[PDB]
């Protein structure tokens, strides 16, 4: 199958400033009729995809002139002359020359802002939950930027691998930060055999990792 | 204007089949290819295949040739996708999209699960003992999505983060809703999370205390 390689995976943009994203094909997309069946789609958050550019450089009806598409051989580019808020979302390139038709993995356009360290909180399981037979330990990272963050659980110094799940909010509409929860799940019997529960957070806004912990 | 209108959300058990529809308007249905596209939760777009309604000609992605069957009903300008022998990995949003992906349907969410309808348990995330405290509610072990969470019957919205649900290996969902508030309010302002799970008619108002 033809592989469509999009870069970067995330582009941090600024309202009023230009943006450029790239999509490269593993095969020529020039068809024998002279057309190059390369398109660009925008998927806004919570919405279905919409086509913006087709046949490398043609704008769909209603698409603002700030968008341009170009191509040289297998190297395709989508450019925005001045980003606006409605441009945020995930951009997919797609080829329709060779079967099966294939998509790139998407490039997310998010808003740049100043680095902000997370505020970190840890919550032991409630007594109500323990009586019910399970234990959830929650680590909250609040209002940080950029999105990249590393959360490591330790239980009496044992690194937990595979025993927790993370969830992240959409970029905040007011302050352009992210928030993240990490939840460690154990049986009540397991929870009661250990003392020190700790979540350690690594983030670019912290000069050294921050650890929040409690003793059961 | 061209419009593609898909059928509503589906919840089915593993091993079942489902048929999703795409009703079109605003153009001659018989004369444009109809594609179908899959999007797994949090993931990218995948092409399933396409059908030319005038004569039934099809092109499939081999990944889906044993899973998906494309048909049409020209007399009602409607395209169909049947997905067979369903498993968890078939849970996704499915889109129909015309021609060179020039117009898209609004999507259909398919959830494949053996789980039964179940309301959540609601547990407090109590504020610990810069003048700011965090508290929340853990909304655990419900099915299907969604649950909704408000604070103080809507009076508290600043600083609230309700996280996307996570699917546990148990087949049930869990999420937390948190809020940051003044530490000085903890002794004098009540904080209550208002949890609603409509599929199970489960509503809970849970006070979160220090």
């Amino acid at each position: 199958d033809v592989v469509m390689t999009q870069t970067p995976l995330t582009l941090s943009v600024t309202i009023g400033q230009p943006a450029s994203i790239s999509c490269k094909s593993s095969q020529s997309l020039l068809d024998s009729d002279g057309k190059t069946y390369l398109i660009w789609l925008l998927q806004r958050p919570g919405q279905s995809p919409k086509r913006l550019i087709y046949l490398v450089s043609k704008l769909d009806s209603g698409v603002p002139d700030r968008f341009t598409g170009s191509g040289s051989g297998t190297d395709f580019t989508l450019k925005i002359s001045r980003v606006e808020a409605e441009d945020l979302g995930v951009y997919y390139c797609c080829q329709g020359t060779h079967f099966p038709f294939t998509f790139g993995v998407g490039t997310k356009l998010e808003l740049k802002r100043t680095v902000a360290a997370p505020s970190v909180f840890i919550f032991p399981p409630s007594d109500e939950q323990l009586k019910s037979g399970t234990a959830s330990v929650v680590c909250l990272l609040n209002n940080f930027y950029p999105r990249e963050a590393k959360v490591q659980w330790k239980v009496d110094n044992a690194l937990q691998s595979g025993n927790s799940q993370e969830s992240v909010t959409e970029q905040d509409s007011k302050d352009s930060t992210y928030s993240l929860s990490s939840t460690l799940t154990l049986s009540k019997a397991d929870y009661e055999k250990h003392k020190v529960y700790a979540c350690e957070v690594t983030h670019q806004g912290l000069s050294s990792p921050v650890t929040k912990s409690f003793n059961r | 204007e061209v419009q593609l209108q898909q059928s509503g959300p589906e919840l089915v058990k593993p091993g079942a089949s489902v048929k999703i529809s795409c009703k079109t308007s605003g153009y001659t249905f018989s004369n444009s290819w109809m594609n179908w596209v899959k999007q797994r939760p949090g993931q990218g777009l995948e092409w399933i295949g396409r059908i030319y309604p005038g004569d039934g000609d099809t092109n499939y992605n081999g990944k889906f040739k044993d899973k998906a069957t494309l048909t049409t009903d020209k007399s009602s300008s409607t395209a169909y996708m049947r997905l067979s022998s369903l498993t968890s990995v078939d849970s996704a949003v499915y889109f129909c999209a015309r021609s060179l992906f020039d117009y898209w349907g609004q999507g259909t969410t398919l959830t494949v699960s053996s789980a039964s309808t179940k309301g959540p348990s609601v547990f407090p995330l109590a504020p610990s003992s810069g003048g700011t405290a965090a508290l929340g509610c853990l909304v655990k072990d419900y099915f299907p999505e969604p649950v909704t969470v408000s604070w103080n019957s809507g009076a508290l919205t600043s600083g609230v983060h309700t996280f996307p649900a996570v699917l546990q290996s148990s087949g049930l969902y869990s999420l937390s809703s948190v809020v940051t508030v003044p530490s000085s309010s903890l002794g004098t302002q009540t904080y209550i999370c208002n949890v609603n799970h409509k599929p199970s008619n489960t509503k809970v108002d849970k006070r979160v205390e220090p």
Partner: peptide, 4 residues
């Protein structure tokens, strides 16, 4: 190859 494509319509429209």
């Amino acid at each position: 190859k494509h319509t429209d």
